[PDB]
């Protein structure tokens, strides 16, 4: 009943990203961002706290703080699986200014609920602290996310970091013998030649959404993960995007049925994006955390901390054998 | 006349990587231009 909040947040953030640049590729991990902001909210009070929690789309008349954090705690317990079949890991860390004493409640909550690692860092040497954090993220993403942090202010007091790593095989993998170059239309007029993978005579969950002018198909991974592909009719992408809502996802899930598909063609591709999320989070109602009125006194006991920036980077690689994706989020907290 | 189904991802599309049980979203993406590795 709380996955709907995370889906609400995912789609609300997506729409803001697309409004600013409607023709760019998009890749991000909403779960990484949600977890990082919930982690941060362990130290928040009053308006700063309620804005973060409502910004994450939780209903505070129906859910307690404890229930929210427990839902992230439970999620983290499952998102740590490992076999050649499917690798999925997620980790949280706090980089703490040297000599800065944290509240017992904050430290204990972070360890218990987010499984966080902690590192004392001298933020006065911003290049060293940057290297430290970027290497931590590089290790957690198995080399896939490098340079998460492009700059750090020397007045930084704490950085909260979340990373996610995903490597999976298709339940029905494509055979590269049947991958051939054909056209992908960027627009009705502009096309590019790309390797199109193909599958034949396949039975998969399928739904033609005539009302929303799009086709939905589900391609499973080996393991507890799936890929949902949504193909809007030409020129309908912007309206399909507006229909991205938890109820739409639920309706798609209820409407998928096994169907025999004669031919399916999917391109190989590898995309990457990085973001500064300050403006979008402000659009979602997270405001006081970024200002001199921030109330993050639940971290050290002093109300002298504000969020300077929230940054995110993510990569997606799709190919015949499976998919590799990873992302990381950093919440930079500076001294007031 | 037979009925058949063909799916061609040859224009911008969405890809959502989800947990099997909760359908929590691990990754959200839109491919407007399929760049190569």
**Do A152 and A49 belong together in one domain?**
yes
Q: Are A142 and A165 in contact (CB under 8 A)?
A: yes
Q: How many residues comprise chain A?
A: 336
To 5 degrees, how large is the angle CA A246–CA A251–CA A254? Answer: 125
Number of Cβ within a 10 Å radius of residue B34: 23
Chain B residues in contact with chain A using a Cβ-Cβ cutoff of 8 Å? 4-37
**Do A210 and A137 belong together in one domain?**
no
Q: Angle, nearest 10°, between helix axes A30-41 and A46-55?
A: 160
Q: Give the per-residue SS3 of A109-173.
A: HHHHHHCCEEEEECCCCHHHHHHHHHHHHHHHCCCCCCCCCCCCCCCEEEEEEEEEEEEEEECCC
Whole-number Å distance between alpha carbons of A162 and A39: 9
Taking alpha carbons only, the member of A144, A96, A143 closest to residue A116 is A96
DSSP lists the bridge partners of residue A195 as A181
3-state helix, strand, coil in chain B (%, to 5): 0, 45, 55
Q: Are A213 and B12 in contact (CB under 8 A)?
A: no
Taking alpha carbons only, the member of B27, B11, B13 closest to residue A216 is B13
Name residues whose C-beta falls within 8 Å of residue A88's C-beta, 6 or more positions apart in sequence: A79, A80, A81, A82, A164, A165, A166, A167, A168, A223, A225, B26
**Do A124 and A153 belong together in one domain?**
yes
Q: Which uninterrupted H or E stretch holds A52?
A: helix A46-55
CATH number at residue A333: 2.30.39.10
DSSP lists the bridge partners of residue A196 as A180, A267
**Do A243 and A285 belong together in one domain?**
no
User: Nearest residue of A to residue B9 by CA position?
Assistant: A266
Method: X-ray
CATH number at residue A107: 3.30.497.10
DSSP lists the bridge partners of residue A163 as A91, A328
**A31–B contact, CB cutoff 8 A:** yes
Q: Is A103 exposed, middle or buried (0-12, 13-18, 19+ CB in 10 A)?
A: middle
The domain tally of chain A equals 2
**Do A153 and A205 belong together in one domain?**
no
| Chain B residues within 8 A of A206 when measuring between CB atoms | 5, 7
Name residues whose C-beta falls within 8 Å of residue A66's C-beta, 6 or more positions apart in sequence: none
Q: Which residue has the tokens 């779960």?
A: A31
Count of helices and strands (H, E) across chain A? 9, 12
**Do A76 and A15 belong together in one domain?**
yes
Contact between B15 and A316 using a beta-carbon 8 Å cutoff: yes
DSSP for A67-118, written as a single string? HHHHHHHHHHHHS-B-SSSEEEEEEEEEEEETT-PPPHHHHHHHHHHH--EE
**What would the two tokens of residue A128 be?**
């060293």
**Do A92 and A65 belong together in one domain?**
yes
**What would the two tokens of residue A6 be?**
């995370």
Whole-number Å distance between alpha carbons of A218 and A228: 5
Q: Is A253 exposed, middle or buried (0-12, 13-18, 19+ CB in 10 A)?
A: middle
Q: How many residues comprise chain B?
A: 37
- The four Cα atoms A328, A86, A324, A265 give a dihedral, to 10 degrees, of -140
Whole-number Å distance between alpha carbons of A192 and A181: 10
Contact between B22 and A3 using a beta-carbon 8 Å cutoff: yes
| Chain B residues within 8 A of A231 when measuring between CB atoms | 7, 9, 11, 13
What is the extent of the structural domain holding A129?
A: 1-169+267-320
Contact between B25 and A10 using a beta-carbon 8 Å cutoff: yes
Taking alpha carbons only, the member of A110, A36, A114 closest to residue A77 is A114
- Collapsing DSSP to helix, strand or coil, A15 comes out as helix
Taking alpha carbons only, the member of B33, B6, B28, B35 closest to residue A229 is B28
**Do A197 and A62 belong together in one domain?**
no
Whole-number Å distance between alpha carbons of A147 and A25: 20
User: Nearest residue of A to residue B22 by CA position?
Assistant: A3
Contact between B15 and A226 using a beta-carbon 8 Å cutoff: no
Contact between A262 and B21 using a beta-carbon 8 Å cutoff: no
Whole-number Å distance between alpha carbons of A28 and A293: 29
User: Nearest residue of A to residue B30 by CA position?
Assistant: A26
**A325–B contact, CB cutoff 8 A:** yes
**What would the two tokens of residue A316 be?**
């997606």
Q: Are A30 and A72 in contact (CB under 8 A)?
A: no
Whole-number Å distance between alpha carbons of A177 and A62: 53
To 5 degrees, how large is the angle CA A156–CA A115–CA A300? Answer: 40
**Do A233 and A291 belong together in one domain?**
no
Query: Which DSSP symbol is given to A176?
Result: G
CA A201, A204, A210, A214 dihedral sign is: negative
CATH topology of domain B1-37: Serpins fold (2.10.310)
Number of Cβ within a 10 Å radius of residue A287: 17
Taking alpha carbons only, the member of A204, A208, A220, A221 closest to residue A255 is A208
**What would the two tokens of residue A204 be?**
């998969």
Whole-number Å distance between alpha carbons of A221 and B27: 14
**What would the two tokens of residue A312 be?**
């995110």
Give the closest-approach CA distance of A132 to chain B in angstroms. 26
Q: Is A258 exposed, middle or buried (0-12, 13-18, 19+ CB in 10 A)?
A: exposed
Contact between B19 and A78 using a beta-carbon 8 Å cutoff: yes
Q: Which residue has the tokens 């999620």?
A: A75
**Do A308 and A177 belong together in one domain?**
no
**Do A239 and A300 belong together in one domain?**
no
**Do A58 and A86 belong together in one domain?**
yes
Number of Cβ within a 10 Å radius of residue A179: 19
- Collapsing DSSP to helix, strand or coil, A263 comes out as strand
Whole-number Å distance between alpha carbons of A221 and A223: 6
**What would the two tokens of residue B10 be?**
């040859």
């Amino acid at each position: 009943g709380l996955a709907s909040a995370n889906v609400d947040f995912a789609f609300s953030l997506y729409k803001q990203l697309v409004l600013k640049a409607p023709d760019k590729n998009v890749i991000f991990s909403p779960l990484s961002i949600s977890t990082a902001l919930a982690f941060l909210s362990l130290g928040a009070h009053n308006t700063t706290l309620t804005e973060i929690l409502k910004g994450l789309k939780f209903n505070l008349t129906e859910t307690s703080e404890a229930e929210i954090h427990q839902s992230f705690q439970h999620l983290l317990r499952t998102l740590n699986q490992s076999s050649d079949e499917l690798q999925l890991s997620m980790g949280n860390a706090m980089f703490v200014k040297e000599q800065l004493s944290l509240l017992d409640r904050f430290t204990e909550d972070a360890k218990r609920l987010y499984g966080s690692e902690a590192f004392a860092t001298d933020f006065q040497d911003s290049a060293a602290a940057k290297k430290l954090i970027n290497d931590y993220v590089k290790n957690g993403t198995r080399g896939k996310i490098t340079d998460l942090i492009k700059d750090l202010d020397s007045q930084t007091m704490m950085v909260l970091v979340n990373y996610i790593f995903f490597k999976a095989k298709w339940e029905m993998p494509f055979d590269p013998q049947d991958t051939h170059q054909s056209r992908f239309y960027l627009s009705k007029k502009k096309w590019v030649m790309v390797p199109m993978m193909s599958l034949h005579h396949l039975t998969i969950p399928y739904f033609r959404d005539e009302e929303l002018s799009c086709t939905v198909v589900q391609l499973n991974y080996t393991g507890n993960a799936s890929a949902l592909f949504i193909l809007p009719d030409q020129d309908k992408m912007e309206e399909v995007e507006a229909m991205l809502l938890p109820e739409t996802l639920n309706r798609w899930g209820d409407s998928l049925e096994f169907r025999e598909i004669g031919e399916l063609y999917l391109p190989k591709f590898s995309i990457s994006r990085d973001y500064n999320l300050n403006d979008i989070l402000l659009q979602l109602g997270i405001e006081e955390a970024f200002t001199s009125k921030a109330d993050l006194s639940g971290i050290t006991g002093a109300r002298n901390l504000a969020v300077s920036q929230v940054v995110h980077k993510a990569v997606l690689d799709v190919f015949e054998e499976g998919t590799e994706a990873s992302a990381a989020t950093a919440v930079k907290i500076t001294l007031l | 006349v037979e009925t058949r189904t063909i799916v061609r991802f040859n224009r911008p599309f969405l890809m959502i990587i989800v947990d099997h049980f909760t359908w929590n979203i691990f990754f959200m993406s839109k491919v407007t231009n399929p760049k190569q590795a």
